[PDB]
Design a protein around this ligand. Structure first.
Ligand SMILES: Cc1[nH]c2ccccc2c1CCNC(=O)c1cccs1
Lengths: 211, 134, 167, 397, 282, 174, 339
């Protein structure tokens, strides 16, 4: 699939794909994929839906990981999104109410959801928040490339493409870029914040996606 | 796992990037010529200087003319200014509000009342919209 | 009150100028929509902060932006009893900030209470009525604090008398 | 561990149980009502009220009931009600005792914040824990058993009966079901049964007698016809007598019969007294456990715990278990035939602390050292806010 | 309720239910109860050695030794006489009621049992009132630490007996409300010229104790009552004792009910603000 | 649930969709002759007190329709037997009552017309009217030896109290 | 003449050629088309495709095609097939919300302003049979708020949050040819910056009927006009009221605008003195004395073109759409001017 996804966008780059079961970073060079350099992020859709439950049981709501799984999943798909700057998001959640939304449940009783909206998807960037050793797609992608050939780096970085159900969270492309930049700056240019600016990353979120 | 500590956006090339004669005022103030002092303090505002020092100065002079006014003598003075003057006055009145003092604020609320009737709410808007201000 | 009406009038006027908001999609984050005056991630979108003061204690800070306004108020507090009644009363409303959708959960540092009015609010509420609520709010909390003060004293006296008259 | 025991207060829609942790029975069991003056409060008029029994007949006072359907509908009145619970009955200096309060399942986080506001901002309690009734009830049954916090709770107070499934200390909210049958309905029924037969019963003392008869001679029978038969054959050793005093004239006797077993019978045959509800309680329980996760149904069936004064009738559980096993075994009979599912073990637990199961659980938990590590302290309240009381970690197993 | 009641309801109700059952002829049920009272007082009602025919009521006061050095045991004995027995381990005073040997009027002893706590304090006051009434001056002052960080000082003089209280206001804002009430006590004479004069010091003790290790601090508060012969005499004594030993709790209780009341004002006000806000909607 | 009859036989005859159940009576009618110690009229009386409280009754076989009819009629007997002063007088009212023509299936005034099959012809019609009259008679005289206590003029209150309750909220007098 | 389509905002609107139908976005992901039947409005079409809030609508009069853009970053050209509107995706190549869209007069292209701080000039290619677009980037530094084509379908005026009002050249030589010179300039290669004004986000921009005059309103409560015939000199006028959000020409020297005051106003340009002047309210009689009960966010000329306009439409955040008559206004206000 990673091959085809690059096909549709009319290219022959890297493909970040995540569904319910798992996440895959498949870099593709002028033709096909290369197992070496191709990794897997062991956290996807489900794991976020599970976290959204621990977060809501923490709020004071009687959810059951099995009886209500499908219900919380729909809450995730409708309300969750990826924080850009977690420090700025926690402030919005702590100091104001602009994140609080109401969600009517199947039987009709209402519940309010706020900070949880971004905290759950955050698992993708801090696996430790749900007990999973890894460094999160952000850091992972950056190692699947930086570690690769030096003759494709620049090409790859300006050719990343999202794919799958767990990649439509609002703001994901933006967070990915901020992370990659942050990694580049320190881990590859020793914090020399001037040679930057000319670092080129273009993580595209295509609309045609469905098919 | 440090690296999220650096605010990368601060180096994003797509971002955005943007007094009067103290003696002349004193001269009219000592002579009791109030309307004149006002019109002099509202001249050549430090609209382009970087130091808050030169600006705080211009503000002081202007503020020293407003406080030095008699309640029933403000309406007249306001109406002697042109729209640009009214807009500039309004910017200073709002500056004065940041330095309350022995009734300094009680009279400034008089200048505001008068200035607004002349410049309309529009002048206040131009206080909120100014990128280069006093 | 010789300084009250003039104060509320300058506040009402500034509030009318700040509540000219419109919906604004994020320029910094894909498919996000945020109250700019809060995240402040795009300087051109912010307006010049202004303050209207009645005296050295009472004032109002008004911070605008293309899509939202933050209004902070410094409440009149004469003596110790008023200071604590005001503080309990502000926390009381803040804990209920969700029902009171224009209130911040915490004040801007240096003030007793803060509002955060967004374009979404001005789209479902007449802005001239919100401006009226902020003025109505300032007048009314002063009265409520005065009444609380009188109530405590009233009950204090009866409590000190009920005990003493029994000896 | 401390020199003083914690205060345990269980507020119900009808009655409030209060006392100190470590004891077995509550120290006071009073009507969840408060009487005030009504006909702009000033001075100390707010303190002019009474609660519990003292509040039911007060001449110049109006009786209010702060809690409806288990949820606080008047915080002003609830806050005062606590004032006397603490200062008049318990006589506890609130700053010295940790408090354990209860709440029905499905209570909102907002309400917990309101409760905490009252306990920390008003009475300045050093620590507060809010437990869910259902879970405490489960814990209460341990007094007669491997102990688990998984099971189905049948709470029948006086307003309504609830079938609450619980898994590992956590209520499966989406699966609760309520039943329009409880102590009150039983009384009313026994009232109709008397009106149609007994005479000389003071019209203004209709309830007094029925409630008395119910509480003194009622019970659950195994079979309706066989029971009716017993009463018509050996009438002398089944028909009981009741004698009351006419409040007007101080002068009456009535035979008590069929109603002894017919009243409680309505739990099993709701169509008897209720035109809108006809599901037998055995069926409601079955439905609930079936709606839950397949992998927790057997544990639920294996631990059905009773709770409330209305599950106190002699043989209540025996009849619930028998009927429940019939509906369940029948379903498994159809399966085999259609096609060997291992039989399902159905237990309906009954114990000595049932009537105030919830309070006893609360009391036993507040006596353990673990309860002090799990309470939200004042310090945490002040440094994190009321939002800390939104989640009370379940403990005890 | 404005004045805190003096008797203990759990003691009274528990006894009555056992006394009524004993009179009826029923077989005695066992009893095991642990409860408290204001000022860290701990109680215990139980059947000594499992004997369901006997009911013991025991009280524990961290500061008993101090009241003991002031006529405590003696006053107690005069009051309970044959009901007082050797104190249960963990407690200071124990009352033993024999269900098989109850007085004709069981109501009279049930009332005294409920006052166990009040009677333990009684002496320290009865003693110093006795001093005043006899002229004996110079007598050292009594120092009762009724709480871990709170103290009461009783001292007699030529024409008056004084009771001082060192009380702590854990909550910082509680001090402010406290003053409002204290000021109204300071002016109580403007309503009852005969009643006790009341003084009040915030942060520091009254000079007489500035040499002693008395406490000082932002949350401490001293209150001085000045009882006169018309209160201390043997005709008012009890009632005076009943009021004065509940004062500390009387004060803190009203400070709390005061906040409860402010809360209802806030609920009403907030509720109104929400109604206006919602009328701004089309 | 409700109490049903256990008399339906793979050889039991039907009149309409009711069951022509045997009975041990002398009265005339097409009711077979019962050999056994219990017939559908005892069963119905044995159960009445309990069944009468039910609001819903599931018809499992055709005998239930017979049980049901007898049950609804017992309530009828109690309507009368309620106001009488003797175990002899009551015997008479029960006779008259039983001979009086009550509504049958198909006619307006017979509850449950949606459950009881209507007589397909004049014979089936006269036969059924007969079977019901015979059931009504045995049922009445049999009910007097129960309702009355060895102390004459005593329509036991333990039979009169049900006079106001209606099985399935239906009536033969309506 | 006021009408209320809903109680929430009408994000944006667009009328067809004959002013027989109006397409509005009700603070929704959808576009609603209403047609009049007698003296009632009736919903006739529901365009559901955008996954985000629609922010701009434009109806191409002759080809009868509707173009929409939304916060979901997409643009959709809508074609009428019998009795249904079918949407065709257009990749704008942006990563922030689109904010505005306008067909060129020749209906050969259309521009989309967005948060990406760029303008997407889109045109169809009968070659590969799909929509493509070039970008105009420099010197735009912020979100593009408004747009307006020049009658020559080449020059494009734009206003954005970087406080500037600019005129560019959307010259695409593969759908049109060498634009004839204009007072704005001679050299018009793609993306050339023809003009740039010299405080306040620019909510609206408008080109006069002949194109030698461009006007725009900003957040600092001012209205401006740059005369191409007078070396692009700029006339400025400070209002004493709240910020205007929309503006159009009604004659070569008359402008109508509206905004946060909730009522339209008239402005006039004295060519000789190079000075703008206040012509006064046009809406002369909740607790408001204006027809709209909330901010007016868009205004369009219904008939008479920008040369001799007779009727114009307004829509606002109150959910209402007003149709104003110029002769009726000239009558009710004996003191009204116009040019
Ligand atoms: C109560 C309830 N109904 C549901 C329907 C579908 C999925 C979950 C649920 C739940 C459990 C979570 N809800 C709550 O805890 C509360 C809802 C409203 C007030 S509390």
């Amino acid at each position: 699939q990673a091959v085809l996804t690059l096909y549709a966008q009319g290219l022959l780059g890297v493909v970040v794909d995540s569904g319910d079961g798992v996440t895959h970073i498949c870099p593709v060079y002028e033709g096909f994929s290369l197992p070496h350099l191709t990794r897997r992020l062991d956290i996807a859709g489900r794991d976020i839906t599970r976290y959204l439950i621990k977060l809501l049981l923490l709020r004071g709501y009687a959810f059951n990981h099995s009886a209500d799984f499908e219900t919380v999943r729909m809450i995730k798909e409708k309300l969750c999104y990826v924080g850009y700057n977690i420090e700025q998001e926690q402030k919005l959640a702590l100091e104001t109410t602009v994140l609080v939304e109401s969600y009517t449940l199947p039987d009709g009783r209402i519940i309010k959801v706020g900070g949880e909206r971004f905290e759950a998807p955050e698992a993708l960037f801090q696996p430790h928040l749900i007990n999973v050793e890894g460094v999160g797609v952000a850091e992972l992608l950056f190692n699947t490339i930086q570690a690769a050939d030096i003759d494709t780096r620049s090409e790859f970085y300006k050719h990343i493409v999202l794919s799958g159900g767990s990649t439509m969270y609002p703001g994901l492309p933006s967070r990915l870029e901020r992370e990659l930049k942050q990694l580049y700056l320190e881990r590859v240019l020793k914090g020399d914040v001037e040679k930057l600016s000319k670092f080129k990353i273009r993580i595209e979120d295509p609309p045609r996606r469905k098919h | 796992a440090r690296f999220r500590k650096v605010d990368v956006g601060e180096y994003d090339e797509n971002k955005f990037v943007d007094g009067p004669d103290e003696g002349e005022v004193d001269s009219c103030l000592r002579q009791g010529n109030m309307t004149a002092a006002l019109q002099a303090a509202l001249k050549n505002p430090p609209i382009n200087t970087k130091s808050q020092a030169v600006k705080d100065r211009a503000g002081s002079i202007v503020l020293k003319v407003l406080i030095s006014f008699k309640a029933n003598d403000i309406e007249k003075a306001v109406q002697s200014l042109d729209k640009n003057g009214v807009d500039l006055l309004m910017k200073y009145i709002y500056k004065g509000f940041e330095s309350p003092s022995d009734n300094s604020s009680a009279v400034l609320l008089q200048w505001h009342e008068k200035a607004l009737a002349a410049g309309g709410v529009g002048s206040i808007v131009r206080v909120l919209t100014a990128r280069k201000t006093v | 009150t010789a300084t009250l009406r003039p104060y509320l009038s300058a506040v009402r006027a500034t509030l009318q100028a700040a509540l000219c908001l419109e919906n604004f999609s994020s320029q910094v984050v894909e498919r996000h929509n945020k109250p700019e005056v809060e995240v402040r991630s795009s300087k051109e979108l912010l307006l010049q902060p202004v303050t209207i003061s009645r005296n050295e204690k009472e004032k109002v800070l008004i911070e605008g932006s293309i899509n939202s306004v933050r209004v902070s108020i410094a409440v009149k507090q004469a003596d110790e009893i008023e200071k604590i009644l005001c503080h309990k009363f502000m926390r009381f409303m803040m804990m209920r900030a969700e029902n009171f959708f224009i209130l911040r959960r915490k004040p801007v540092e240096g003030y007793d209470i803060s509002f955060l009015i967004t374009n979404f609010h001005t789209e479902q509420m007449y802005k001239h009525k919100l401006v009226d609520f902020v003025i109505h709010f300032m007048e009314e909390i002063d009265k409520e604090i005065s009444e609380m003060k009188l109530s405590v004293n009233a009950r204090a006296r009866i409590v000190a008398e009920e005990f003493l008259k029994n000896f | 561990a401390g020199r003083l025991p914690a205060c345990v207060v269980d507020c119900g829609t009808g009655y409030t149980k209060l006392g100190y942790a470590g004891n077995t029975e509550p120290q006071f069991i009073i009507p969840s009502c408060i009487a005030i003056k009504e006909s702009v409060m000033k001075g100390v008029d707010d303190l002019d009220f009474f609660i519990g029994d003292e509040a039911i007949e007060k001449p110049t006072y109006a009786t209010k009931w702060p809690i409806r359907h288990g949820i606080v509908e008047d915080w002003d009145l609830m806050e005062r009600f606590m004032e006397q619970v603490i200062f008049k009955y318990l006589r506890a200096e609130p700053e010295d005792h940790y408090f354990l309060l209860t709440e029905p399942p499905l209570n909102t986080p907002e309400n917990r914040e309101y409760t905490a506001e009252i306990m920390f901002e008003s009475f300045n309690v050093p620590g507060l824990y809010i437990a869910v009734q259902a879970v405490l009830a489960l814990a209460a049954s341990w007094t007669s058993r491997e102990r688990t916090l998984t099971g189905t709770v049948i709470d029948s107070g006086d307003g309504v009966t609830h079938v609450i499934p619980v898994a590992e200390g956590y209520v499966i909210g989406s699966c609760i079901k309520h039943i329009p049958i409880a102590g009150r309905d039983i009384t009313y029924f026994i009232q109709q049964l008397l009106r149609d037969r007994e005479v000389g019963i003071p019209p203004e003392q209709s309830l007094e007698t029925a409630k008395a008869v119910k509480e003194r001679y009622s019970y659950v029978c195994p079979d309706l016809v066989k029971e009716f038969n017993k009463y018509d054959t050996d009438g002398s050793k089944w028909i009981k007598q009741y004698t009351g005093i006419n409040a007007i004239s101080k002068k009456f006797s009535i035979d008590v019969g069929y109603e002894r077993f017919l009243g409680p019978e309505i739990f099993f045959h709701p169509e008897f007294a209720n035109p809108d509800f006809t599901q037998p309680i055995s069926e409601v329980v079955d439905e609930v456990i079936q709606n839950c996760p397949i992998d927790v149904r057997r544990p639920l069936y294996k631990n059905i715990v009773l709770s409330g004064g209305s599950t106190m009738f002699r043989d209540f559980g025996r009849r619930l278990q028998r009927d429940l096993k019939r509906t369940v075994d029948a379903r498994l009979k159809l399966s085999e035939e259609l096609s060997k599912p291992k039989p399902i073990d159905v237990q309906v637990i009954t114990h000595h602390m049932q009537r105030y199961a919830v309070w006893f659980g609360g009391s036993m938990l507040a006596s353990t050292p673990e309860f002090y590590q799990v309470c939200h302290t004042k310090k945490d309240y002040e440094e994190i806010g009321p939002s800390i009381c939104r989640h009370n970690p379940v403990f005890g197993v | 309720m404005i004045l805190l009641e003096v008797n203990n309801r759990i003691i009274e109700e528990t006894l009555a239910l056992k006394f009524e059952n004993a009179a009826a002829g029923n077989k005695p049920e066992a009893v095991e109860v642990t409860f408290a009272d204001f000022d860290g007082v701990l109680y215990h009602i139980s059947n000594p050695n499992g004997d369901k025919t006997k009911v013991m009521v025991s009280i524990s006061l961290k500061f008993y030794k101090e009241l003991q050095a002031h006529g405590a045991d003696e006053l107690l004995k005069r009051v309970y006489g044959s009901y007082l027995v050797n104190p249960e381990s963990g407690y200071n005073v124990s009352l033993l009621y024999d269900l098989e040997n109850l007085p004709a009027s069981k109501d009279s002893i049930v009332h005294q049992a409920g006052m166990l706590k009040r009677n333990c304090f009684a002496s320290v006051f009865e003693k110093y009132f006795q001093f005043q009434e006899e002229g004996k001056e110079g007598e050292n002052r009594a120092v009762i630490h009724y709480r871990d960080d709170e103290t009461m000082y009783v001292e007699s003089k030529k024409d008056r007996v004084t009771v001082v209280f060192s009380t702590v206001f854990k909550d910082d804002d509680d001090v402010v409300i406290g003053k409002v009430f204290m000021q109204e006590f300071k002016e109580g004479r403007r309503a009852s010229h005969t009643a006790p004069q009341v003084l009040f010091s915030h942060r520091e003790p009254p000079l007489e104790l500035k040499d002693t290790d008395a406490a000082v601090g932002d949350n401490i508060g001293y209150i001085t009552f000045v009882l006169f012969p018309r209160h201390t005499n043997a005709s008012a004594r009890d009632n005076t004792i009943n009021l004065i030993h509940t004062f500390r709790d009387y004060l803190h209780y009203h400070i709390k009910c005061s906040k409860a009341y402010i809360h209802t004002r806030m609920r009403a006000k907030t509720s109104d603000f929400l109604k206006v806000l919602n009328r701004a909607r089309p | 649930p409700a109490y049903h009859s256990s008399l339906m036989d793979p050889d039991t005859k039907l009149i309409g969709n009711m069951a022509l159940l045997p009975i041990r009576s002398q009265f005339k009618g097409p009711a077979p002759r019962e050999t056994k110690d219990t017939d559908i009229v005892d069963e119905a009386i044995y159960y009445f007190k309990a069944n009468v409280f039910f609001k819903n009754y599931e018809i499992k076989n055709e005998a239930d329709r017979t049980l049901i009819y007898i049950t609804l009629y017992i309530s009828e007997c109690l309507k009368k037997l309620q106001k009488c002063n003797s175990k002899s007088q009551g015997e008479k009212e029960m006779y008259t009552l039983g001979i009086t023509n009550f509504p049958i299936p198909g006619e307006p005034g017979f509850p449950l017309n949606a459950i009881y099959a209507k007589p397909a012809n004049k014979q089936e019609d006269e036969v059924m009217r007969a079977y019901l009259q015979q059931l009504r008679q045995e049922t009445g005289l049999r009910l007097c030896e129960k309702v009355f206590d060895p102390q004459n003029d005593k329509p036991s209150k333990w039979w009169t109290c049900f006079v106001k309750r209606q099985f399935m909220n239906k009536s033969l007098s309506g | 003449a006021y009408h209320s389509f809903l109680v929430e905002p009408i994000s944006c609107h667009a009328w067809n050629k004959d002013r027989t139908q109006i397409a509005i976005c009700p603070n929704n992901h959808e576009v609603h088309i209403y047609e009049k039947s007698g003296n009632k409005w009736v919903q006739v079409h529901e365009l559901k495709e955008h996954n985000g809030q629609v922010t701009g609508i434009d109806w191409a009069p002759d080809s009868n095609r509707i173009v929409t853009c939304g916060t979901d970053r997409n643009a959709y050209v809508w074609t009428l097939k019998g009795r249904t509107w079918k949407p065709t995706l257009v990749i704008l190549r942006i990563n922030r919300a689109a904010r505005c869209v306008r067909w060129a007069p020749n209906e050969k292209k259309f521009a989309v302003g967005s948060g990406s701080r760029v303008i997407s000039i889109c045109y169809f290619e009968q070659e590969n049979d799909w929509w493509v677009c070039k970008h105009i980037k420099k010197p735009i530094r912020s979100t593009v708020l408004s747009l307006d084509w020049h009658p020559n379908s080449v020059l494009l005026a734009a206003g954005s949050c970087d406080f500037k009002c600019r005129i560019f050249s959307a010259y695409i030589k593969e759908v049109e040819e060498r634009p004839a010179p204009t007072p704005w300039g001679s050299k018009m290669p793609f993306g050339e910056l023809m003009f740039e004004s010299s405080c306040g986000w620019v909510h609206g921009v408008c080109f006069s009927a002949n194109g030698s005059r461009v006007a725009w309103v900003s957040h600092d409560s001012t209205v401006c006009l740059a005369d191409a015939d007078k070396k692009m000199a700029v006339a400025t006028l400070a209002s004493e009221t709240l910020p205007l959000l929309a503006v159009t020409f009604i004659t070569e020297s008359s402008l109508v605008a509206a905004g946060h005051d909730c009522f339209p106003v008239l402005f006039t340009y004295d060519s000789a003195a190079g000075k703008l002047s206040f012509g006064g309210r046009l809406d002369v009689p909740a607790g408001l004395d204006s027809l709209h009960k909330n901010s007016v966010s868009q205004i369009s000329v219904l008939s008479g073109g920008k040369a001799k306009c007779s009727q114009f439409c307004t829509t606002g955040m109150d959910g209402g759409m007003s149709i104003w008559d110029v002769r009726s206004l000239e009558s009710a206000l004996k003191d009204l001017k116009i040019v």
